[PDB]
Write an enzyme that holds these catalytic residues in place. Sequence first.
Site, PDB file in Angstrom:
ATOM      1  N   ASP B 186       0.814  -1.263   0.150  1.00 16.86           N
ATOM      2  CA  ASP B 186       0.017   0.036   0.080  1.00 16.86           C
ATOM      3  C   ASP B 186       0.931   1.194  -0.148  1.00 16.86           C
ATOM      4  O   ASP B 186       1.821   1.341   0.682  1.00 16.86           O
ATOM      5  CB  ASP B 186      -0.920  -0.081   1.296  1.00 16.86           C
ATOM      6  CG  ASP B 186      -1.568   1.229   1.614  1.00 16.86           C
ATOM      7  OD1 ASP B 186      -1.003   2.077   1.952  1.00 16.86           O
ATOM      8  OD2 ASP B 186      -2.727   1.382   0.958  1.00 16.86           O
ATOM      9  N   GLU B 216       2.143  -1.132  -5.514  1.00 12.79           N
ATOM     10  CA  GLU B 216       1.122  -0.041  -5.440  1.00 12.79           C
ATOM     11  C   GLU B 216       1.662   1.164  -5.728  1.00 12.79           C
ATOM     12  O   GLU B 216       2.078   1.932  -4.602  1.00 12.79           O
ATOM     13  CB  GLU B 216      -0.216   0.069  -4.340  1.00 12.79           C
ATOM     14  CG  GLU B 216      -1.120   0.888  -4.894  1.00 12.79           C
ATOM     15  CD  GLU B 216      -1.595   1.908  -3.858  1.00 12.79           C
ATOM     16  OE1 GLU B 216      -0.823   2.199  -2.977  1.00 12.79           O
ATOM     17  OE2 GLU B 216      -3.006   2.393  -4.057  1.00 12.79           O
TER      18      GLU B 216
END
Lengths: 441, 441
Positions: B186, B216
């Site tokens: 993340d 990500e």
Amino acid sequence: MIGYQIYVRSFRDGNLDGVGDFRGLKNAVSYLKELGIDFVWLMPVFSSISFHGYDVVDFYSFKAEYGSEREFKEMIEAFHDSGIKVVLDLPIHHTGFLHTWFQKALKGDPHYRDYYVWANKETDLDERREWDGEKIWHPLEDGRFYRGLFGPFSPDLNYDNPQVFDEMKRLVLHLLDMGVDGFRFDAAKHMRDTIEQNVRFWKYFLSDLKGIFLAEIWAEARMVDEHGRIFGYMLNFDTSHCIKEAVWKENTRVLIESIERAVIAKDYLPVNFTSNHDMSRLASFEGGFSKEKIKLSISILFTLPGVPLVFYGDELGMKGVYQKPNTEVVLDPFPWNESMCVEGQTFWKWPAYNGPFSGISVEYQKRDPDSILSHTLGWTRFRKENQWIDRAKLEFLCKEDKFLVYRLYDDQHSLKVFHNLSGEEVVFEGVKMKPYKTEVV
Amino acid sequence: MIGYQIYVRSFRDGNLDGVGDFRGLKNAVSYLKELGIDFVWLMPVFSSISFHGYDVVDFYSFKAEYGSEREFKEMIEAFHDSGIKVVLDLPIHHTGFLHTWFQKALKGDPHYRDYYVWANKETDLDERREWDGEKIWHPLEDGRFYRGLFGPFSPDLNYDNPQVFDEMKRLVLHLLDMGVDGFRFDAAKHMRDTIEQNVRFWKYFLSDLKGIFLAEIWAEARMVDEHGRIFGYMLNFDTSHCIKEAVWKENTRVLIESIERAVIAKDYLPVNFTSNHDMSRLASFEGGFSKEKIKLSISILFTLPGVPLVFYGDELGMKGVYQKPNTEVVLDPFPWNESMCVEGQTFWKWPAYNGPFSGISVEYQKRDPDSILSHTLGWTRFRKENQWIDRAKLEFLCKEDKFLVYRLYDDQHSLKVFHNLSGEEVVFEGVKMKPYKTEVV
Ligand SMILES: C[C@H]1O[C@H](O[C@@H]2C(CO)=C[C@H](N[C@H]3[C@H](O)[C@@H](O)[C@@H](O[C@H]4[C@H](O)[C@@H](O)[C@@H](O[C@H]5[C@H](O)[C@@H](O)[C@@H](O)O[C@@H]5CO)O[C@@H]4CO)O[C@@H]3C)[C@H](O)[C@H]2O)[C@H](O)[C@@H](O)[C@@H]1O
Ligand SMILES: C[C@H]1O[C@H](O[C@@H]2C(CO)=C[C@H](N[C@H]3[C@H](O)[C@@H](O)[C@@H](O[C@H]4[C@H](O)[C@@H](O)[C@@H](O[C@H]5[C@H](O)[C@@H](O)[C@@H](O)O[C@@H]5CO)O[C@@H]4CO)O[C@@H]3C)[C@H](O)[C@H]2O)[C@H](O)[C@@H](O)[C@@H]1O
Ligand SMILES: [Ca+2]
Ligand SMILES: [Ca+2]
């Protein structure tokens, strides 16, 4: 006696996940105790797949998200250690669509097949509810129809069947035997098809059972009485409304009528509340209303006989407008601080009406002596010191248009109340009743 | 390789509380194996008080509601049992405000105070996020200012500090021995201040580890390329959005420049997703689009090199218009059946864009060959017998404003694909393609 209605998931989190649970409930005691709460009414702690859990799939297992049966008990223990009772909401009127009892009745099983209500050649299928009037008869493909007042997924339980009776009564003894101080029989008004049948039902059902028995018979004052005695604690929807309606329409009439009508001299204890989960919150009554009007409604509630109940968050004036089918708009997370970011805060969903930094949190209001909580903290403390008002007798000394004044007394007491519903001072017996204020002499 | 992004609370319930958990996730395996899923990416499963769970308060404990470590692992095995890998969303960029280290850092602990980022007298306190453009520097009563690119309650860790590195290095290891197959990092884009520092970091962080490391990074393909080789798997926002916009505009232009831009010749696997929780769902893309264009988006996704990922429910048509702060509108409960009332179903809140009896449930589409589910099934099933396509090579046989034709090949494999972006028929080299249809030969 002062009650407090809690929606578990929105009150306090105890295992750091943002979802209200039994452990957090346990750690909220100081708040409750500082609020003078005598007992907590806990909305459905039984496992159901909904968020409100009124369609129970098993009464012998709790909602995993709230906790384990062990955790449930240590919360009971704790609450007692602190002198607070714990009343569980019991929706025994119907089981969820997935309850193993219904799952079996469906799959032919005969023993459980009698546990529920089915259509008979001599039965009206177009039969609807008395209120919203949606049909109560729901179809299965095999041409079968089981009745379910609250929808096709909340199959009504056959209380005609003396098996269901024991089946359930054994449960009430179970939770009690477990520590539960009382129950809030959800839908108590619909256990049987005739007013007379229901009265006797409760008569037997509560025969040899002690504890707080709170019933929900949302009806005309007249009916609530018949059951009244049997439970000992009846939810007073009458007055609960009339207080707000009177404060709203700045007129004592309806409140006076409702006081005499639904409070004065009863074989039971009318439980008067601020609001609940089936309606808009106190702070949103009729398009929401004045911060000073909110207090006045709380003052009146605590200066009237019966048992005062506060729906969690109403002491902070949490906003909320009742809506369907998303009834969770009135079940916002209880705001402990302004950021809504503190060890304990719930946040299972983003607030609908009460978001962060709204100036309505516990830690915010606790400070400002002018806050709704600081105010409520005032009447909760007062009512704590005056438990004689529960059964106290009322005597009206002034029935004007914009103001009311009556007297509460018993064998060794007598207190005079002054409620001013207008926003302009009025005087009675030397007393200068301020705008929207309750005085106590 | 086909992926599946699951927001645990909205997928399957295994403890009958109508909330998603590790037990239901386990019970959702038949579904996934039959849907052709090779690995599921699971949104934050660590303790946090938010509903999404990106502000972690401990990475060594699982979100109470989802279950225990016990259940977490009993699930890990069952998923491995069925040939499925478990990638975990790992929000190690920052910690939640309540996380221990930050609370200790708030007091001054020498050790933990340096686990976070503090402003300096020569630090532009009014810095700004590149995109929405909000404050990065958050104030503290005592003049202090810490840095949290995602909010004052999501204070980023300081990676110039080896302890923060070690701290997180152990974590990954911990979760890996635990049986986890990989991580979806993340905000993997902001681990360091310099685009060079970030790569160095990631390079060094993952230098001696093994597993599916899905990063990500929400940036132009050029940036995704630099980090590419290091993770091996990169979430492809570039092409993921183009497959959607090109469909919406019936104009293959953007798609081609995109496929060329981020899919052709890469030293790592571009992960192409239907959508995610940070934007509207496929079905609601730009005012949402027709059951036709949805299948076309999926068709295109499963006929491109890289790794096709489905955000849970997108195979069903689940609508969901993204927005803030109530970002849970795209996290609607995955609908197993129309009434959304069957053991395993979740209903922790009333659906925002996918209420009951909407014709999008799993049980409803399993009995219709034209449903978005049947269509996705064929695509996943197909791509299942064509593992070569992920590492496959592409060259465009035909480029026309409204329909695309290309060739997938490797050494021993070769396939022709025909995509029609318009609602008007088109034919190429003796092969007509109905409106919005896809053909492979
Ligand atoms: C399946 C359901 O489960 C849960 O629904 C719940 C269930 C079912 O487990 C029972 C309880 N509530 C019931 C109550 O037990 C029942 O008797 C009737 O109560 C109706 C009442 O019968 C009717 O007469 C009129 O009452 C009148 C009085 O008769 C009149 O004298 C004067 O006071 O005005 C009022 C209102 O104008 O309206 C009331 C509500 O609109 O419906 C309410 C919702 C719970 O509080 C409720 O959360 C969820 O809450 C639901 O969202 C879900 O759909
Ligand atoms: C604390 C927060 O936690 C969660 O937010 C979560 C967190 C926090 O741990 C991270 C992730 N998402 C982050 C991402 O990791 C970050 O790098 C940036 O990503 C920005 C991106 O950096 C920027 O450049 C631009 O991207 C550009 C591309 O660079 C350009 O090439 C072309 O494609 O156009 C796009 C957009 O025009 O916009 C993106 C989103 O708006 O923000 C998104 C929201 C998660 O998906 C998200 O659920 C919750 O979702 C929040 O609600 C909560 O407030
Ligand atoms: Ca919890
Ligand atoms: Ca659950």
